[PDB]
Amino acid sequence: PRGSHMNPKRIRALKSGKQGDGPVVYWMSRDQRAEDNWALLFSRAIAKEANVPVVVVFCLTDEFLEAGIRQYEFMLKGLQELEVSLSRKKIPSFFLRGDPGEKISRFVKDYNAGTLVTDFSPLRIKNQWIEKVISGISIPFFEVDAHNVVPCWEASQKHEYAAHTFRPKLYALLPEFLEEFPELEPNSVTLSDVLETGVKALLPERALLKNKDPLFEPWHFEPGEKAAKKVMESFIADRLDSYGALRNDPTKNMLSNLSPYLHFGQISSQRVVLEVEKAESNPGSKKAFLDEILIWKEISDNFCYYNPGYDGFESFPSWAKESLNAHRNDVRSHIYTLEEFEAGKTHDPLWNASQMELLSTGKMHGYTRMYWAKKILEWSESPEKALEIAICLNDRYELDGRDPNGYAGIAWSIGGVHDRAWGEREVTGKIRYMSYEGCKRKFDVKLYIEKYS
DNA sequence: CGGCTTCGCGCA
DNA sequence: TGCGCGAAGCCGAT
Ligand SMILES: Cc1cc2nc3c(=O)[nH]c(=O)nc-3n(C[C@H](O)[C@H](O)[C@H](O)COP(=O)(O)OP(=O)(O)OC[C@H]3O[C@@H](n4cnc5c(N)ncnc54)[C@H](O)[C@@H]3O)c2cc1C
């Protein structure tokens, strides 16, 4: 519907109805940014065709209490910045509190909205909210993929077994869907209290040391749309060249460090891709980084979109389910409870340091996250309980948590999703093994351990 | 049947 | 350090 720099395959109809006479509403959830946002861009273009203004609505659920302050403050601080950015474009933004199923339905009826638009998330709860909203409105309802370069439903119509089968499908579609963004045209027809409330409720559950001092260090990542672009620029200028060689060395700060911003949608992944492609850097680094942000990120969306049990044992490939089941009665060399993992009270100082990097920074290094989750399986009572422990700690403490990438990455580590079978072992069966000595031969483990006590 | 993210391991 | 191989199962291939 309408457009010049607008591929209509990025948009799909969720509900048919008679377009009302009122404003077009972008229900923003996953992509909390004003620039490089196809969902906001398509809402703007729709509003222009109907000769009405575009508005933005955001509903804050009670689901923040299940995580921590660190995610709550990162999102809210960024949202305070976004509120101003939209204001400059004469686009009003309304922030609701409660269940989106009821509030968004009510918001469209009370403000006489003409069209409703939302962005795309493959997670179960978003689909739940959408179905409730559909049953509570009569205006058309659209969905736009503003998070993936190639729309999730276009890249593939099925669960992809591996990156080597998904890669050619995804990259074949890049010349069509990888394109520059148009400017957001302003409207022509023209929070801080929520933040103090949520913190007061989340203070009793704060991660604290033995000195009653909080563990989280908030200065490693400034939230917001402007900071995200700043992190992207310094990556291309200072880190991209060495990425290909040092990306898996957790003693070196060579990752992009973009994942917190990407998760809350404060920066567009397509934007990162556009700028990295144009950079003249190590071709091996660019290929490695573009592979991660394109293939692996968007195959995580694919995984959750086509496996609604994406966070459960049932979603593992049959060979992994058969192997792990056979080893359910094997004696584990160690058994730790969730609380003992959470506090870093295992026998393994490398594991403990990884959990400490997570507790202190809210961003565990990408390489050690594999080691971290595989030892949770190795030292747990059962595969299901390891999945519970890993998902729990990931979503509680990772700034980028509660994300398709986390479920796919944990399912890769514990259940062999998007991996293959390896040598038979006790307890972990044919799931890929990673060892302390394997890490010693790859990077300075003692240095990593010492930085994080 | 070729060859698989991120493996360990032997060996330059 | 980097490379090649081993141990495994299966997908798209033919
Ligand atoms: C056990 C486990 C849990 C994970 N949990 C999360 C999570 O909660 N949130 C999250 O965003 N990522 C998660 N990942 C993926 C990966 O570890 C992080 O995306 C990465 O560490 C973020 O740092 P970065 O942006 O510097 O990564 P970079 O090396 O700079 O990569 C750039 C971007 O590529 C994407 N990417 C990189 N590696 C992967 C991967 N394996 N799968 C999917 N996308 C990837 C991410 O969007 C990332 O931000 C998890 C991986 C594992 C093994």
Automatic annotation (TrEMBL):
Its EC number is 4.1.99.3. GO terms for molecular function: deoxyribodipyrimidine photo-lyase activity; DNA binding. One of its GO terms (biological process) is photoreactive repair. Residues 22-152 form the Photolyase/cryptochrome alpha/beta domain. It is an enzyme of class 4 (lyase). It comes from the Archaea. Keywords: Chromophore, DNA damage, DNA repair, DNA-binding, FAD, Flavoprotein, Lyase. Its cofactor is FAD; coenzyme F420-(gamma-Glu)n. Gene3D superfamilies: 1.25.40.80, DNA Cyclobutane Dipyrimidine Photolyase, subunit A, domain 3, HUPs. It catalyses: cyclobutadipyrimidine (in DNA) = 2 pyrimidine residues (in DNA). Belongs to the DNA photolyase class-2 family. NCBIfam families: phr2. PANTHER family: DEOXYRIBODIPYRIMIDINE PHOTO-LYASE, DEOXYRIBODIPYRIMIDINE PHOTOLYASE. This is Deoxyribodipyrimidine photo-lyase. It comes from Methanosarcina mazei (Methanosarcina frisia).
